[PDB]
């Protein structure tokens, strides 16, 4: 008997990564972008995309030769073998989805409360935060597959709303409000925000952890990554220009929960405000459905077992059911211990260390996968610099959030050495070799 997985086409994989990227930036941290970057936000999204494309250079080179549902972990193991670092990075990869759920949790509430006229409490937000995570945990048992089939349709609808937001957003604008502020008292904020908005291009995760469930992976994994980054880059900027141009920046800081919902009111009314708020929840729900069922489930099973099943359903929690509750538990927890700006900082920090190890892997395997050494040196220094800029900012901005970021990297390394002593779990070439 030979089983076969249901496999994704190029555009299915693109829609998947685009949906996750959009849900994490357009409807999640756009209100954070107003407070820090301000009018430099459209320039921020470009600069953020630059780092991503540098990361993509290593991913697309490694993903062209190495096929695995392990993703980065596969590449990393091929370079540095099995050890405590490889295992920490696997748990770190799982944690990247965990904290992502916290970011999607906050975003969902930001657009939901103003829709039904509810005050912005620490408690009234928290009710939605626990609730929405509980809804997607319960979805595992009846609806996870059905929502996953709708994801492609939802992404398009969410895109079409944004596609009308630009075409009809470039009408009653303030071209004197979109002019890039060149004064270094607000320029450094653009570069500091680009360290946070690195997460805006988190498409690497969902794609690489589904690489064995994608048609012609050696070809379509690189392409999906490359196409995904270039699409959202145009979407971010085109919406960023419109949002700043139609609304005063001080009104955007106080509407940090819903940045675009209030932005639609002046030039589309409450009917246009209704269309944004509805299409927001749908976009964040489908992004989370993708993160839990396709990413978190895969990341957890690999971190726990040391390998992955050859044949599994992507759109359910296919193995180790306790992992679903644990992932959901920390998903709510992070959305409580930290704020909208707090969650985003951690998420971006986790990803950068994964990418840094991906770049380091590309360096080591450059004989096998190919590439230009001097570009493989360049992006490494860039990402590290951006990673340091995020730590530098957080230390001089938020004490409470700064230590939360530091604790993560230690707590992951502690858990690894402990877990490796208890279970003796090893990682092997099983991840990418066959048969």
């Amino acid at each position, epitope marked *: *008997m*030979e*089983l076969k997985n249901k496999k994704l086409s190029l555009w299915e994989a693109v829609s998947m990564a685009v949906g996750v990227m959009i849900g994490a930036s357009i409807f999640s941290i756009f209100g954070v972008g107003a407070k820090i970057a301000g009018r430099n936000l459209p320039e921020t999204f470009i600069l953020s995309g630059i780092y991503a494309l540098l990361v993509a250079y290593s991913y697309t080179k490694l993903g062209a030769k190495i096929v695995s549902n392990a993703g980065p972990i596969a590449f990393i193991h091929k370079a540095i073998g099995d050890n405590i670092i490889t295992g920490a990075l696997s748990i770190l990869l799982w944690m990247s989805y965990v904290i992502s759920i916290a970011l999607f949790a906050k975003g969902f509430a930001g657009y939901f409360l103003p829709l039904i006229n509810a005050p912005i409490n620490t408690f009234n937000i928290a009710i939605t935060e626990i609730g929405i995570v509980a809804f997607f945990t319960a979805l595992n048992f009846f609806g996870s597959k059905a929502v996953g089939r709708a994801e492609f349709f939802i992404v398009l609808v969410a895109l079409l709303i944004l596609g009308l937001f630009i075409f009809a957003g470039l009408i009653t604008i303030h071209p004197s409000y979109v002019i890039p502020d060149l004064a270094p008292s607000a320029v450094s904020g653009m570069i500091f925000a680009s360290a946070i908005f690195f997460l805006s291009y988190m498409g690497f995760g969902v794609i690489t952890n589904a690489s064995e469930h994608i048609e012609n992976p050696k070809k379509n994994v690189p392409r999906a990554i490359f196409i995904s980054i270039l699409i959202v880059m145009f979407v971010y900027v085109g919406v960023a220009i419109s949002a700043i141009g139609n609304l005063p920046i001080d009104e955007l800081i106080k509407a940090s929960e819903n940045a675009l919902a209030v932005a639609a009111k002046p030039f589309l009314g409450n009917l246009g405000f209704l269309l944004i708020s509805i299409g927001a929840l749908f976009s964040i729900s489908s992004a989370m459905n993708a993160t839990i069922y396709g990413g978190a489930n895969v990341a957890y099973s690999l971190a*726990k*077992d040391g*390998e992955l*099943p*050859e*044949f*599994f*359903e*992507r*759109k*359910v*929690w*296919f*193995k*180790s059911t306790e992992g679903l509750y644990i992932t959901s538990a920390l998903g709510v927890l992070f959305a409580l211990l930290f704020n909208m700006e707090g969650v985003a900082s951690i998420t971006s920090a986790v990803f950068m260390v994964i990418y840094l190890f991906v770049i380091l892997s590309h360096y080591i395997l450059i004989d096998e996968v190919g590439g230009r050494k001097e570009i493989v040196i360049f992006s490494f220094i860039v990402v590290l610099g951006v990673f340091l800029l995020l730590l530098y900012y957080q230390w001089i901005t938020n004490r409470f959030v700064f230590y939360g970021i530091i604790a993560t990297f230690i707590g992951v390394l502690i858990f690894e050495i402990i877990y490796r002593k208890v279970t003796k779990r*090893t990682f092997s070439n*099983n991840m990418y070799v066959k*048969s």
Partner: antibody
Framework: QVQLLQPGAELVKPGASVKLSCKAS????????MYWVKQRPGQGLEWIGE????????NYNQNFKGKATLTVDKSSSTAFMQLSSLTSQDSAVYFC?????????????????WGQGTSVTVSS | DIVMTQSPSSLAMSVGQKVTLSCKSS????????????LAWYQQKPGQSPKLLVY???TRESGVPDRFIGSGSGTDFTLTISSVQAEDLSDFFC?????????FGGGTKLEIKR
């Protein structure tokens, strides 16, 4: 190409234990179930139990819940069945057999590849 | 626990004849969602391990001769050998692969008549 290596025969004294081995090659050991099957000479087949070699999860036939214990060695792709307190009623051929495992789904599968079997004699 | 019953225990058929092996289950083996019947057939020659012939009631296993056809539904199932060849003498077992305590039929022994 895909094969399961079991030793031919085993002689063991009554009341003692025996550990039977099933070495797997040609496929990824942890991606499939490992089942064990009992057959008495000239009679039918009994399913003893299943092990998931990835996490060593086990599920037993009620009639074997104290007689048989299933373990694996991931590193060497080998499955073991421990048989305890052996009587003459345990004199049989014991097969290991692979079964496909499609994880997050409603499909269960039969046994597509079998070992040659280990015939266990329990005698003084 | 599902009990599997095969009838008869043994039959004799001559080379070229059509053989019909019957197998019944205590419970329906049809899963009404994703609608397949979880029944397998095995062939066991003397001294050898069992060989999977058919799974999910109707699909032949890779490498199995055309002569072997599985059919049936719910609680009643058939294995048909369209035309028996001398080397087909063996013990045929059905097995449900529906729910965890997997169970076999007592087998049907096929001898070649001459």
């Amino acid at each position: 190409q895909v094969q399961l290596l079991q030793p031919g025969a085993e002689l063991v004294k009554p009341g003692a234990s025996v550990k039977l081995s099933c070495k797997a090659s040609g496929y990824t050991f942890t991606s499939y179930w490992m089942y064990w099957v009992k057959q008495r000479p000239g009679q039918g087949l009994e399913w003893i139990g299943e092990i998931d070699p990835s996490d060593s999860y086990t599920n037993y036939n009620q009639n074997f819940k104290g007689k048989a214990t299933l373990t694996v060695d991931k590193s060497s792709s080998t499955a073991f069945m421990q048989l305890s307190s052996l009587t003459s009623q345990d004199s049989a051929v014991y097969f290991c057999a692979r079964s496909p495992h499609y994880y997050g789904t409603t499909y269960n599968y039969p046994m597509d590849y079998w070992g040659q079997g280990t015939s266990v004699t329990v005698s003084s | 626990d599902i009990v599997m019953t095969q009838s008869p225990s043994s039959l004799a058929m001559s080379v070229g004849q059509k053989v019909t092996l019957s197998c019944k289950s205590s419970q329906s083996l049809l899963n009404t969602s994703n609608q397949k019947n979880y029944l397998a057939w095995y062939q066991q020659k003397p001294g050898q391990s069992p060989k999977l012939l058919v799974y999910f009631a109707s699909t032949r296993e890779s490498g199995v001769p055309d002569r072997f056809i599985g059919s049936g539904s719910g609680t009643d199932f058939t294995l048909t050998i369209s035309s028996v060849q001398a080397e087909d003498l063996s013990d045929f077992f059905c097995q449900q692969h529906y729910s965890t305590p997997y169970t076999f039929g007592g087998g049907t022994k096929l001898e070649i008549k001459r």
